[PDB]
Structure formats: C-alpha cells, structure tokens
C-alpha cells in the first residue's frame, strides 16, 4: 500500500507545532529535573522517560518535516526503501521502550510502597541509570523481528506514516499484546499503590488520633485535683499508647511506647496510693519522653506519606495519558483489516501514538512540586 497522492493544499501546521511543543517540553523537563541533580529513585526514572521522548522526537519527526517540499511527502527517498525503514523502525522502537519505561516507574512504586522488605533492600540509585540500556535492549530485540522478510511496511493515506501493517503474519497482534499487558501491569501497580496509600492514610490517622488522645488527657491531669480524675485520664492514655504502637525506626517506635507505658504504670501506681502531686510530676516527665521518640516518628510519617503520594500523582496522570492513546492501537491491531472496507481506525491509532509522547513531558511541566493543593483536595 503506497499512497503517493496528496492534496496540494497541505500545510506543515500540525507537524511543526507538534515538534516544537515536544522539544520544548522535553528541554523544560530536563532543565527542571537537573535542578534536583546535585533526586530520588523515582525521579531518575522520569529523567529517562523524557529522554526517550526527546531522543525519539529528534529521529521520527525531522523525517517528515524536510519532506514537505514536494507534493508526494515520501515515496522512496533512499534506495531499498530506506526512508520508511528508518521511520517505521524508530516509531516501533520508541513506542514499546517508552511504555516499558513506564512499567519501571510503576514497578518501582510497587516494590517500595507495596513491600516494606524491598524498601529495606538496597536498590542502587545508579542502577536506575542502567535500566535505560536494558529497556532499549529488550525493545530492540522485539523490534528487530519486522526487519526480517515476514515483516511488512506499507505507506498510510497521509503519506507520512508507514507503521506495521496488519496481515497474515502474526506480529502486529503480538506487538499490541505486549502494549496491552503493560497497560494492565502498570494499572495493577497503580491500583496496588493506591490501596497501600489509603491503608497508610488510615494508619497515620489512627496514629494521629492516639497522639491527640495522649496530649488532651495529659492537660487534664495537670488540673485534676482529685485522684479519681487522674486515674481516669491515665486509663485512656494507656489504652491509646498500646493502640499507637501497633527497620531501625520500627524498633525505636516500639521501644518508645514500651518505656512510655511503663511511665503510665508508674503514674497509675502513685494515683492508687493517693499521691496526686507525685502522679502529676510523672505526667510532666511523660511529655518529654513522648516528644523525644514518638514525635520524631510522626513527623517522618507525615513527610514520607506526603512525598510518596506526590510521586503517585505524577505516575497516575502519565499512565492515564498512555492508556487513552494506546487503546485505539490495541483495537486496530486486534481487528482484522479485511473487516473494514475503508479502515479509519488505523489513522486514528497513528495520531494518538505520537501525541502521548508529546503530552508526557508537558505533564511534568504542569505538575510542579507545589502539588499540595492536588494532594489534599
């Protein structure tokens, strides 16, 4: 299928603005990520995601840009159909490898948030840099198959696309199978992290509620003259301490309440004997011990939960804008070409497949680190 004919009134309006927006978003994303480089395991993966979009844009886009001079965009620019052989291989490579890069981002949050053991397990930050050659290596092996004899490339109707053609050869079905499985895999990791984050919010809420129970009842002991009110306030504090207590920080958190409950038992011991003033004296020492160990864990809990949920928002917007664009290609590949006499889903799948790589760097440009409004809305 070689569609040489093209209306003379073709203007390079859509191509130029798309290439400009893509390169500008990639450069802005690289410049803003370089500010952190002087940076986390999740951020270093975003650097390779915009780098893959920038590397692909510099190879895929300029091919159709220079060929806009003639009426026929690109029939055969170089012998042996080298023009499409370079265009089709580039779009096929930078589409599966880019989706594999999203899987590495989703798998990172899945291992870190989902499994506490994998977080304690050392994952070298420099190892994240080695992911990019591995992702390109796996994608290169799968994308090398259509380069053989059974692989076929035909020119689409606009004359600038020559992506994989549906035929008797079973490769377009396998290529969409990997993309479909990756979408489900990335969504499965996101759904797991969301469930883990929601469970993390309830644990922090219960921990904060027990923290308020300790502080509120502590003020009652200071103004409680009768020993009955002192024993009643210490009773709710002791139960709240056992509920809050339920890695180096984990061992210190348990030991923090183990000595804290003992101070409550000592204050309850003086309250039973009738020493109200001595019981209030132990209550003052209880505040110093609690702020030394327990308060430090609460501050880290609020900071860690806030930082990880921001990375999830960055991951959630990107996978949504990969899913809406990759679904037309999934339906197009699975459906037979002979089923539709005048196939129109093919051209639509080509558009979204290129748009998603352009939107991804702009997503990070809109979602700045001040996402506190999006975190709690």
């Amino acid at each position, epitope marked *: 299928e070689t569609r040489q004919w093209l209306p003379p009134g073709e203007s390079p309006a859509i191509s130029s603005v798309m290439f400009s927006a893509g390169v500008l978003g990639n450069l802005i994303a690289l410049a803003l990520l370089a500010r952190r480089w002087r940076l986390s395991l999740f951020h270093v993966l975003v650097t390779e995601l915009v780098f893959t979009d920038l590397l692909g844009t510099c190879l895929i886009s300029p091919v159709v840009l220079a060929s806009y001079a003639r009426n026929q965009t690109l029939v055969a620019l170089a012998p042996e159909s080298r023009a499409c052989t370079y265009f089709a291989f580039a779009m096929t490579f930078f589409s599966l490898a880019t989706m594999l890069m999203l899987f590495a981002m989703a798998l990172e949050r899945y291992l870190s948030i989902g499994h506490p053991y994998f977080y304690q397990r050392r994952v070298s930050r420099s190892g994240g840099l080695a992911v990019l050659p591995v992702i390109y290596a796996v994608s290169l092996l799968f994308c090398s198959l259509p380069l053989l004899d059974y692989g076929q490339y035909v020119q689409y109707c606009p004359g600038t696309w020559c992506f994989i053609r549906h035929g008797r050869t079973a490769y377009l079905q396998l290529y969409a199978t990997l993309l479909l499985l990756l979408i489900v895999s990335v969504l499965a990791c996101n759904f797991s992290v969301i469930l883990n984050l929601i469970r993390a919010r309830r644990q922090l809420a219960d921990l904060e509620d027990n923290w308020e129970t300790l502080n509120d009842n502590l003020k009652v002991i200071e103004k409680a003259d009768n020993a009955a009110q002192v024993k*009643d306030a210490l*009773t709710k504090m*002791r139960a709240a301490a*056992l*509920d809050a207590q339920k890695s180096p920080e984990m061992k210190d958190f348990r030991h923090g309440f*183990d000595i804290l409950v003992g101070q409550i*038992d000592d204050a309850l011991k003086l309250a039973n004997e009738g020493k109200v003033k001595e019981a209030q004296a132990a209550a003052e020492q209880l505040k110093t011990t609690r702020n030394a160990y327990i308060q430090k864990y609460l501050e880290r809990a609020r900071s860690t939960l806030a930082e990880e949920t921001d990375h999830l928002i960055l991951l959630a917007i990107m996978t949504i804008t990969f899913a809406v664009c990759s679904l037309p290609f999934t339906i197009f590949a699975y459906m037979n070409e002979t089923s539709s006499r005048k196939e129109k889903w093919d051209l639509q799948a080509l558009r979204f497949l290129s748009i998603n790589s352009i939107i991804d760097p702009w997503v990070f440009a809109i979602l700045r680190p001040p996402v506190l409004r999006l975190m709690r809305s």
Partner: antibody
Amino acid sequence: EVQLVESGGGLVQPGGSLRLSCAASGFNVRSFSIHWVRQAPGKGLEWVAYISSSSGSTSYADSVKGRFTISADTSKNTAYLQMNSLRAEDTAVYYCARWGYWPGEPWWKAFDYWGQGTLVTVSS
Amino acid sequence: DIQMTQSPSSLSASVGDRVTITCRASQSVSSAVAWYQQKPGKAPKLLIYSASSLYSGVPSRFSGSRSGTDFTLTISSLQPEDFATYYCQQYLYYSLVTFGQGTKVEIKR
C-alpha cells in the same frame, strides 16, 4: 510445670478472719505479679486482689477495700491473703493466677495459668 | 471503671456449627481483651490472648477478631470437649480487671 495450689479455705463465721495461701511451683514469684480472683456460685468471675512482688504494690477491689490484706513471701515463694470482717456474700471460690510485667510476651498472656481454687463459706 | 458487657448469655448449637460471641467494652481498649473457658467443676483456661494470637496448647478451632470497640470470639466447629462456659476479661491495667457476664454453650435437640 507452672502450677498454683491454693489452701486455707473452708468454713468461717461472720465477722471473723481467714488466711488463704497460694503456693507457686515452676517459677519465681518475684518475676510475676500474683492475682486473686473470686467467683460466686451461679455467677461469673471477679478480680479481688493483686500484688506485685517486684516493687511491693498492692491493689484490691472497690467493694473489698479496707477488709483484705495481701502479701507475698519470696523466701517461701508464695502469697498470703488475710480476710477480716467477712460477710454473707463472701461464700465463693478463690483462684490464684500470675501475670507478667510490662513489657514482654507474658504480659499480654494475662492469666495463662489458673490455680485449682479453694471454697470459702461464711455462714453462722 | 470500665464495665465489660457480654451480649451472648445463652446459645444452643451442635457439633460442626459456628458460634459467635460478642464482647463490648465500656471504654476503648486497644488489645486488652481475653477469652477464658471454664468447665463445670474445673478451673478456667485461657483460649485467646490479645484477641489476635492463639494460646499455646488450645485447639485452632477458636479465633478472635476486633472491630472498633467490639471483640468477637469465633468457633468454627463445636466438639463434645468444647461445651463449657465462656468469659470475657479486660486486662488494661493491673488494678483494672473486670469480667463479663459469661456465656455457656448448650447442646440443642
């Protein structure tokens, strides 16, 4: 193994005094607090006394304050409870138990071993 | 002065049936709720401690669960050796120990 034997129960006239003894075997009383629970015939359980031989603190039920006196002897490794000015409602069964100190695993295992208990009947 | 209230007071079932007992605490207690089994003419025995773990020696048929301030004792399959009175106890403090009202399972016919 860990065993707790109670003794000293029986018939007591109202307004008198009785000395109950709880002997432990298999462990030391200085590492576990000793509790005395009472159960009335045709009713449930009711904690009536507690002592901690590690520090010497004692506690009783609000209904029995001022009439019971609990003590522990580490030389003999046992507990003695003296009951003065008994009433008609004291006809019950007394059980002896141990409770570990906080923190640790035996602390959450409250009353892991229960004694045989002895019967007390206060009737004139 | 927490007053433990046990709603199940009399339940009749046979072997193989599931039994559910509920214990209610007047005040919030984190995990200081234990279940004890007392046979007629015998000393009680601890079944479930901390409402999560199982005692070393008791059969695995008994299980414990927590929901808010309500504790649940679940027996999957009854046996002729499990027909005894059940008691709920709180052990939040050494001086704060209050038992429930009791629950004795019966054989239905």
